[PDB]
Write a structure and sequence with these properties.
By secondary structure, the chain is mostly beta strands. It has a 7-stranded mixed beta sheet. It has a 6-stranded mixed β-barrel with strand order 2-3-8-4-7-6. A 4-stranded antiparallel beta sheet has the order 15-16-20-19, with no helix packed on it. The protein is built from 4 helices and 24 strands. The protein folds into 2 domains: 170 residues, Cathepsin D, subunit A, domain 1, CATH 2.40.70.10; 156 residues, Acid Proteases (Cathepsin D, subunit A, domain 1, Beta Barrel). The structure holds (1S)-2-amino-1-(4-bromophenyl)ethan-1-ol (6LY). The site of (1S)-2-amino-1-(4-bromophenyl)ethan-1-ol (6LY) has 12 residues, from loops. This is Endothiapepsin. It comes from Cryphonectria parasitica (Chestnut blight fungus). GO terms for molecular function: aspartic-type endopeptidase activity. Keywords: Aspartyl protease, Disulfide bond, Hydrolase, Protease, Signal, Zymogen.
Length: 330
């Protein structure tokens, strides 16, 4: 089997992407944030505290003939940005772009933190990291990808995120028309539950490539590109007026600036992030200070190849027995 679904930015900055997902029988369609940095499929639901729901579409398991309470199971998750959610668990039929999994754990939120409530466009998350990170207790549950894997034509999914435009998540096949050149594959460590890999270096604009190992995770659920302070300082030093602002919480730059591109290494290959991808616009409405799309990972404990990086590439998440990551230009 295979599946193919369009993923759409939630706003004009590409802060996140939502993908329609069918849950239950008859189908209830929710728009979920596919997150290669976590492993829970959770949704706003009929059980979510009413004051914490504001415009989201909810899953109502009592209206699904295939929903079953997973007795005794609870979940609770905290994300890198400080947001959180928790609740109980059903199993139900879940389909993405034509690919159906039966008995998928669908984690129903009883509580969500304010940042979820405040974002009307995201009805929940669909985790695509390794199932070892799933938070369901006392019986850990599998991700949608893990459940689908044996059925898939090939045990892979691909992320093809757009810049200020829709893109595609495919399951079970590699669309050879969706990228240019060849896909370069690189080793993955699953030891921490993430799609963790090592970039071979970087360049800023038309500068020389610096060969240096940068360990990081491929994370579709993180907006920005978080890299070591040395690398980030080298980048922003090429933008007149750029500075790290403790008040704003990172690098800002004059909105009048042109940004240089940023290149990262994948083995001997190179992925070029155009300068415009690194512009996240005014820090507040009407400001002439703009927020940078490349920020320091110092104090995160790991580097994060988030959407800013991933959307410059066609990315293969290969879940074969020995997982790997593939990157192509597009
Ligand atoms: N996208 C999931 C989010 O919780 C996350 C943020 C940062 C890191 Br490191 C891992 C995961």
């Amino acid at each position: 089997s295979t599946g193919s679904a369009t993923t759409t930015p939630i706003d004009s900055l590409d802060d996140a992407y939502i993908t329609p997902v069918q849950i239950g029988t008859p189908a209830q369609t929710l728009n979920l944030d596919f997150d290669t940095g976590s492993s829970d499929l959770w949704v706003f639901s009929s059980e979510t505290t009413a004051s914490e729901v504001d415009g989201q579409t909810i899953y109502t398991p009592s209206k699904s003939t295939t929903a079953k309470l997973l007795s005794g199971a609870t979940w609770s998750i905290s994300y890198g940005d400080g947001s959180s959610s928790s609740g109980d668990v059903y199993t139900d039929t879940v389909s993405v772009g034509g690919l159906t999994v039966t008995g998928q754990a669908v984690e129903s939120a009883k509580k969500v933190s304010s940042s979820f409530t405040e974002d009307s466009t995201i009805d929940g998350l669909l985790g695509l990291a390794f199932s070892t990170l799933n938070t369901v207790s006392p019986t850990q549950q599998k991700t949608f990808f893990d459940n689908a894997k044996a059925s898939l034509d090939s045990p892979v999914f691909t992320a093809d995120l757009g810049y200020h435009a829709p893109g595609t998540y495919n399951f079970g096949f590699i669309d050879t028309t969706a990228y240019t050149g060849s896909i370069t594959y690189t080793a993955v460590s699953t030891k921490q539950g993430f799609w963790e890999w090592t970039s071979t270096g970087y360049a800023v604009g038309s500068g020389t490539f610096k060969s240096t190992s940068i360990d990081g995770i491929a994370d579709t659920g993180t907006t920005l590109l978080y890299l070591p302070a040395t690398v980030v300082s080298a980048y922003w030093a090429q933008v007149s007026g750029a500075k790290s602002s403790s008040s704003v919480g990172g690098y800002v730059f004059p909105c009048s600036a042109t940004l240089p591109s940023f290149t990262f290494g994948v083995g001997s290959a190179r992925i070029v992030i155009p300068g415009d991808y690194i512009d996240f616009g005014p820090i507040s409405t009407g400001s002439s200070s703009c927020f940078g799309g490349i920020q320091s990972s110092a104090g995160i404990g790991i580097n994060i190849f988030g959407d800013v990086a991933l959307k410059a590439a066609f990315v293969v998440f290969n879940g074969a027995t020995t997982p790997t990551l593939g990157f192509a230009s597009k």
